[PDB]
Structures are given as structure tokens and as C-alpha cells.
Amino acid sequence: VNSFSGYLKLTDNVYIKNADIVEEAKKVKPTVVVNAANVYLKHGGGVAGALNKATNNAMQVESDDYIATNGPLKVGGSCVLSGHNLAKHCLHVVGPNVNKGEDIQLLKSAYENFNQHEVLLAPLLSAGIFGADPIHSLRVCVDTVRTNVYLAVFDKNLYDKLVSSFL
Numbered sequence: 001v002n003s004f005s006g007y008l009k010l011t012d013n014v015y016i017k018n019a020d021i022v023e024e025a026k027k028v029k030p031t032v033v034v035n036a037a038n039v040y041l042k043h044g045g046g047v048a049g050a051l052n053k054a055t056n057n058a059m060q061v062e063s064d065d066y067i068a069t070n071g072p073l074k075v076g077g078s079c080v081l082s083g084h085n086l087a088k089h090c091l092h093v094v095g096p097n098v099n100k101g102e103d104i105q106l107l108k109s110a111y112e113n114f115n116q117h118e119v120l121l122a123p124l125l126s127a128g129i130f131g132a133d134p135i136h137s138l139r140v141c142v143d144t145v146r147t148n149v150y151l152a153v154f155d156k157n158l159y160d161k162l163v164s165s166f167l
């Protein structure tokens with residue numbers, strides 16, 4: 001039993017909700033919140049901008065130190081950093097950004113990072129400003145993640161389309 005509320009169960013291990021991941025994180029304080037990161041951990045917009053703003057820029061400060069030490073992530077890769085006031089940990093995961101020309105086949109690799117964590121709150125990787133089809137992102141998630149994932153979809157209209165079209 002966990003503290004997530006109001007989710008629709010899609011499969012054994014995947015759950016979904018129309019919600020703002022920032023407000024959802026601030027209420028559940030999950031062990032792991034997933035950020036829709038880029039390789040530079042520059043949290044400017046989209047989910048990353050909203051998560052970082054909610055931490056009063058502490059996420060960005062921590063991230064800049066991480067990059068200065070380790071260099072950029074790989075597309076499809078991840079790193080674990082602090083969750084600040086939102087969660088115990090933040091798993092920064094780099095989905096391919098279609099608006100940069102990155103290979104959508106890397107979306108599966110990106111979701112594989114979730115399997116290193118028993119339970120996660122997450123957005124749909126590569127959705128929104130990363131330019132991928134969210135219906136495809138949800139499909140890859142369901143077919144790749146084996147751990148317990150609670151997906152937050154900010155747009156109420158998009159959520160209903162994902163549910164009604166889910167196979």
C-alpha cells in the first residue's frame with residue numbers, strides 16, 4: 001500500500017492520473033520523482049522548469065555542480081539527485097527531444113532507467129516540449145517499465161485521449 005490517490009490502473013504496474021506533477025510531488029513526497037531532463041540538466045521549461053521553480057532553483061544549483069563534475073548525461077540516460085522539497089530523490093531522465101532530431105528508439109532506453117526504482121512518480125518521457133507522441137510514450141512506458149509507475153499528465157484533454165485510446 002502506498003499514498004498515491006485517484007489514479008486509473010492501466011496494467012499490473014502502471015497507473016495514470018490527470019495531475020500537475022509539481023503539486024502531486026508536494027503532496028505525496030514520493031521516494032522518487034522523475035524529471036524530464038536534458039543532457040545538460042538545464043531545467044528551463046516544461047516539466048523540468050516547473051520542478052526546478054518549485055525548488056526555488058535549488059535543483060538547478062545542484063545540477064550545475066553535477067554537470068561541472070561529471071559532464072553531460074547521455075540521451076536515454078539518467079542520474080539520481082536530491083528531490084529537494086518535492087521527493088526524497090529526483091531521477092533526472094533524458095528522453096529524446098524530437099524537436100532536436102533525436103532517435104525515438106532511445107525512448108525505450110530512457111524508460112529502462114525507471115526499473116532501478118521500485119516506485120516512481122513520473123511524467124510521460126519525451127512528451128510535451130520534447131515533441132514525441134504521448135500515446136507512443138505511454139505505450140513504451142507500459143511495455144518497458146516493470147516497477148510501479150504513477151504517471152501524471154498535466155493536460156486534462158490529453159489524459160482523456162490517452163485513457164480512451166489505451167489498448
Ligand SMILES: CC(C)[C@H](CO)Nc1ncnc2[nH]c3c(N)cccc3c12
Nearest residue numbers: 020021046047050127128152153154155
Ligand atoms: C510530458 C507532457 C505529456 C505533460 C503534458 O501535461 N507534461 C506535464 N505533465 C505533468 N505535470 C506537468 N506539470 C507541468 C508544469 N507545471 C509546467 C509545464 C509542463 C508540465 C507537466
Ligand SMILES: [Cl-]
Nearest residue numbers: 046047128129
Ligand atoms: Cl512537460
